[PDB]
Copies of this chain bind each other. A is one copy, B any other.
Amino acid sequence: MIQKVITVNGIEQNLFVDAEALLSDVLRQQLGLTGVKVGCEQGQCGACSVILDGKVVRACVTKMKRVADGAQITTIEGVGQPENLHPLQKAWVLHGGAQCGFCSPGFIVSAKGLLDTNADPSREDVRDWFQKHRNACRCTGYKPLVDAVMDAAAVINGKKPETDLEFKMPADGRIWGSKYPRPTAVAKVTGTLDYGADLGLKMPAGTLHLAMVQAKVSHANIKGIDTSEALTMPGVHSVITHKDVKGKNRITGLITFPTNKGDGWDRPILCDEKVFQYGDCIALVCADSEANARAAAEKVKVDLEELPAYMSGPAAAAEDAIEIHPGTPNVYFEQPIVKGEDTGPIFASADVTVEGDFYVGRQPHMPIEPDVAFAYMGDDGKCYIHSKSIGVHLHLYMIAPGVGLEPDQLVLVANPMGGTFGYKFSPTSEALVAVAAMATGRPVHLRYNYQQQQQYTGKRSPWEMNVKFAAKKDGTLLAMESDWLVDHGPYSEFGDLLTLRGAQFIGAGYNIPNIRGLGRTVATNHVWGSAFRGYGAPQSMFASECLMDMLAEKLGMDPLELRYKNAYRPGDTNPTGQEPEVFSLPDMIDQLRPKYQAALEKAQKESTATHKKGVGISIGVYGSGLDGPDASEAWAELNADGTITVHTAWEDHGQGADIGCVGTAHEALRPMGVAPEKIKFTWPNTATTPNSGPSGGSRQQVMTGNAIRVACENLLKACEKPGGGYYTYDELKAADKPTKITGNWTASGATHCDAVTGLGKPFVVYMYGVFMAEVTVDVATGQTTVDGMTLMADLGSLCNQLATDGQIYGGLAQGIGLALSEDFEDIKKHATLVGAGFPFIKQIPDKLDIVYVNHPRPDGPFGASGVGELPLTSPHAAIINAIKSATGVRIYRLPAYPEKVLEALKA
């Protein structure tokens, strides 16, 4: 051990450390500076950036031996605090740079280091700095972050007053549609919002820390577990196995379709008889620390009989493949789509037909924060779980039978969380921590490392697709055929539903009167499927939007004009036979057209012999809602102090549940003149908030926003005075009148898609958009650079523009990754950010352009649709279409790795 006397955030610290200890651990654990966020633990994400003697360093890869006596360290806590915010912090708030907020401390500290060395950076200097310092963000697409740095720099430089970093209320006092900052932003930019790992450090000494004993093969029969050596190791309390599970030891898929061949009870909590994928949790070590638990987990010996593993859909779907779940066929679900007339004769007589085989793979969500959860037995006898769940009520019912609790004896709560992008539509750690809390009686905390985040959370499910179009010479679509095979890994939850998305979204955007297709879901031993932002549309619309460009090419037609010819107009129906609710695609195309023509001309002018430029288009469509007559509930409560609490379970991945609640409620409460800062939101909790439903399907703004609107309307009625005006809280309580008022809303017009035909009215609101990608391909290397992305977006009406702009930039950035670099195919190689192709800032162009073309929705609150998934529906199709424009090469199977593009260029 060594004494080191240094200065941390301006205060001398008399530190006692191991010279080998990591600075991140010292700062977080020894000094309580949980504003230093740790994600990857491998120097790749920047979340743990600190200033050490004027240099920005990653604390997770800086050992204390590198910190000299007398060193100066700055963490986010030393940059500024609430009510003493630094210009960078104020600018982050103003520009909406904290979505999940997990990266915000690191970017802000890194940015302070930049500005301390270069006071007046260009935007490119900012981008170069964040690239060099590895500052990674999965939510924002980086542009808002650069905007904030530039604004802060101008203030620090004396070029504008610091008061200009403070939001200015609009003339009219309307926050709906504005750039009002989100309530959580101050806590995020100051490092004072505690995420699950932070909470773990702040839990009491009795708390047990868990480590998973995981399968290191993809498929096996388990013969036994030997915990004997582990129990002798430092700090070990016990080891938990399936024998300690008090219920069924299975998670239920809950809404398994009747025509699914499986019962939906396939997924274990703790493996008993089999390993179904690499990473499956077989046991939990409970210890006094994460480090001691992990060391002991390495010593638990699992005796198993390895089985041949099926590592892709086609392999598992073979007629003679062995059933992974004995008694259920590996191909466990099929969804037909049968619209209009038989397609065979139409293809035979059509002027033009095209066909393609396409693939979209196992995209990894890659939030900067790896999965984390904790649980405890309450003094009320209930088991409480605090996790990254984005569907607390849903998950309660998915896990309760398996853990052995009645629903009223379990409570799920959503912690502040550092992004999910859908992986938290699935249970991950909740049942594990519940079982351990119940078995031990003690609080328990489980933190995944980044390799566990990659290997042992769910993934976008790969689809192998064949799609065909028949059309007239003038470009009018006549018919479509489709076939898709969904590799869902071993656990069925929502896999049938995902397969149904292909019936809904392959070919969406256009009038297609005649469709015949079939989706199939197959169990494999690769990673199980969890929703990933877009949930079936990125697969579906990659196929159809690429195929539209192939049709245009075969016709000799411009691909934007082919889309214009076919885009939904009054009278048309979508693939499930439903009329669109608004008709904004022609408007968006007409507004994009001159920008597209200008981009084509620029691409021609700026292309060189080696660097070929191209422009690509695609359309995106997705529902806002869960299928059928989805619903939500909110409670609007006048508090004694005159504030209003709007109680919901709107789960915040980081997208903005806080501001969505406040903005929607503000607009609904306008007759009573309620200031936005007087409106409070509630963190999701199954015991104390209503069942607003999950934050999936781009649904909360529509469903929960309508419920909030209704609840607030009902609170206004409850407050209205005879003669005009409104009663105060004191007046209402004196009259023994209610102050907490419910509202509900249901998408009553919607119907589930039919099991035989696929037809129905599954959503009452959709999101519509048109993408344009501008790219450069180096034809010597195959490397593609995305130089610009544009989204024409119809969101109906904006609740909050900082929120929606940020949603769109983040989705576009994920689309660049999906197109060019990302996958989870290689269990080890793809288990790091860099290994799996995470998009760092230079991969994302600074030119991300949005044009809102909003057509108010009949059923949306104040006309709003959702936004969350729209920007990932098909940006990757536009990008691949742009590579084709540039070079003549079509990549059919994502991602467009440089060697893959090269091979195609040279063929």
Contact = CB atoms under 8 A, between A and B. Distances in A.
B82 A15 contact: no
B205 A289 contact: yes
A734 interface: no
Interface stretch (A373-381, A422-430, A471-479, A848-856): A373-381
Interface string A1-40: 1110000001111111111010000100111100000000
A291 B29 CA distance: 19
A449 interface: no
Which among A187, A205, A377 has the greatest number of chain B C-beta atoms within 10 A?
A205
A378 B194 CA distance: 35
A83 interface: yes
Given A15-B202, A17-B204, A443 B1 contact: yes
A704 to B, nearest CB: 22
Q: How many copies does the complex hold?
A: 2
Nearest to A442: B1
Nearest to A411: B3
Contacts of A291: 205
A34 B94 CA distance: 34
Contacts of A205: 29, 289, 291
A415 to B, nearest CB: 8
Interface string A194-207: 10000100111110
B199 A16 contact: yes
A36 to B, nearest CB: 13
A72 interface: no
A235 interface: yes
A202 B289 CA distance: 16
B376 A1 contact: yes
A384 interface: yes
Contact of A1 (B2, B83, B377): B377
Contacts of A14: 194, 199
B11 A379 contact: no
Contacts of A204: 1, 16-18, 21, 26, 29-30
B192 A11 contact: yes
A859 interface: no
Contacts of A289: 205
Given A11-B82, A443-B16, A30 B202 contact: yes
A14 B685 CA distance: 14
A288 interface: yes
Nearest to A416: B14
Given A30-B202, A30-B203, A84-B84, 19 more contacts: A1-B204, A1-B376, A1-B378, A1-B379, A2-B378, A2-B379, A3-B384, A3-B386, A10-B82, A11-B192, A15-B202, A16-B199, A16-B202, A16-B374, A18-B204, A26-B204, A31-B32, A31-B202, A32-B32
Interface of A: 1-3, 10-19, 21, 26, 29-32, 82-84, 187, 192, 194, 199, 202-206, 235, 288-289, 291, 374, 376-379, 384, 386, 413, 443
Instruction: Kindly list the 6 A-B residue pairs having the minimum CB-CB distance in the complex, ordered from nearest.
Output: A32-B32, A1-B376, A30-B202, A1-B443, A16-B203, A11-B192
